Every structure is written in C-alpha cells, then in structure tokens.
C-alpha cells in the first residue's frame, strides 16, 4: 500500500501517482509530489554508489531492491527498502515504473 508510479515517457521520469502511505511517510502533500523525479527525497547522507545501481536498473529496465537514506519534508532521516519494477503493455513495451517503500 506504500508505493509510487513514475512515467518514463515524460521528461525526467516524473512521479504521476503516490499512495496515501507514501505521503504520510515523506510528510509531503500529493500536490508537492506529482511531476517531480523521486531523487528530491535524497540528501547529504544518501550513498551515491546505491543511486548508481538504481540508474543502471532503470536504463536496463530490470527489477532491483536496495536500502538508502531518504529525507522527509522536515529534514528527518529514515532508511528506505526500495523495490523497483518495470510495467510492460500487451506489446511488451515499457509504460511505467512502480516503486515500493
Ligand atoms: C518509481 C520510482 C520510484 C523511486 N523511488 C525512489 C525513492 O523513494 N528514493 C530514492 O532515493 N530514489 C528513488 N528513485 C530513483 C530516483 O528517482 C533516481 O532514479 C535516482 O536518483 C537515479 O537517477 P538520477 O541519476 O537521474 O538521479 C525512484 C525511481 C523510480 C522510477
């Protein structure tokens, strides 16, 4: 129930949907999320080596799980177990990415 959907067919693969659980965890309103790339949750303590693996997984359109530090609106650190998965259409072509926190 804690998930976001991004559209890679739009500039910079922005979040088009976020579940109420995701808004509660990050302390952002729906209006502050829609249209942004998910990277805005990152900050000083975010391991750049883990961010690299996510970039490679998106490029290759492979599913991946990783732990990384993210920041709430009020600058509170929390660990995030992130399960990234591609979503393909009936013609086997990529439409969306789904993330789980
Ligand atoms: C559906 C989806 C959800 C994502 N959720 C997160 C997240 O919760 N935290 C995070 O640090 N990165 C998340 N990312 C990855 C970042 O938005 C971004 O891909 C990452 O920083 C690497 O790309 P960049 O090098 O262009 O920033 C998510 C990506 C997708 C497609």
Swiss-Prot record:
Autophosphorylated in response to blue light irradiation. 2 molecules of FMN bind covalently to cysteines after exposure to blue light and are reversed in the dark. It is found in: Cell membrane. FMN 2 binds at residues 37, 39, 42, 55, 70, 80, 82, 101. It comes from the Eukaryota. Signal peptide: none annotated. Residues 62-101 form the PAC domain. Expressed in leaves, stems and flowers, and to a lower extent in roots. Present in guard cells (at protein level). Changing residue 101 to K: Blue-shifted light absorption (maximum at 441 nm) and emitted fluorescence (487 nm). Red-shifted light emitted fluorescence (502 nm) but normal absorption (maximum at 447 nm). The modification S-4a-FMN cysteine is found at residue 38. Changing residue 4 to T: Red-shifted emitted light fluorescence (502 nm) but normal absorption (maximum at 447 nm). The flavoproteins improved LOV (iLOVs) are fluorescent flavoproteins engineered from PHOT2 by improving its photostability and brighteness, and which maybe used as oxygen-independent fluorescent reporters with a small size. The iLOVs are PHOT2 fragments (385-496) and contain many amino-acid substitutions relative to cv. Columbia, to confer different properties in term of stablity, brightness and color. Induction: Light fluence rate-dependent induction, independent of light quality. Disruption phenotype: Plants lacking both PHOT1 and PHOT2 have curled downward leaves missing color changes and lower petiole angles in response to weak or strong blue light (BL). Impaired proton H(+) pumping associated with altered increased ATP hydrolysis and absence of binding between 14-3-3 protein and H(+)-ATPase (e.g. AHA1 and AHA2) in response to BL in guard cells of plants missing PHOT1 and PHOT2. Undergoes a photocycle characterized by fluorescence and absorption changes induced by blue light. Half-time of photoproduct formation is 11 seconds and 15 seconds for dark regeneration. Protein kinase that acts as a blue light photoreceptor in a signal-transduction pathway for photo-induced movements. Triggers the phosphorylation of AHA1 and AHA2 C-terminal penultimate Thr in guard cells to activate them and induce stomatal opening in response to blue light (BL). Also phosphorylates BLUS1, a kinase involved in stomatal opening. Mediates calcium spiking of extra- and intracellular origins in response to blue light. Involved in hypocotyl phototropism. Belongs to the protein kinase superfamily. AGC Ser/Thr protein kinase family. Homodimer. Interacts with PKS1, PKS2, RPT3 and PHOT1. Associates with CBC1 and CBC2. Binds to BHP. The activation loop within the kinase domain is the target of phosphorylation. The PAS (PER-ARNT-SIM) domains are required for the binding of FMN chromophores. This is Phototropin-2. The gene is PHOT2.
């Amino acid at each position: 129930k804690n998930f976001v959907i991004s559209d890679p067919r739009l500039p910079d693969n922005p979040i088009i949907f976020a579940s109420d659980s995701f808004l509660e965890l990050t302390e952002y309103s729906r209006e502050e999320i829609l249209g942004r790339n998910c990277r805005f949750l990152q900050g000083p303590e975010t391991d750049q080596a883990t961010v690299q693996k996510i970039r490679d997984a998106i490029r290759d359109q492979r599913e991946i799980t990783v732990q990384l530090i993210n920041y709430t609106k009020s600058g509170k650190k929390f660990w995030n177990l992130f399960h990234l998965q591609p979503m393909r259409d009936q013609k086997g072509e990529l439409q969306y990415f789904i993330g789980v926190q």
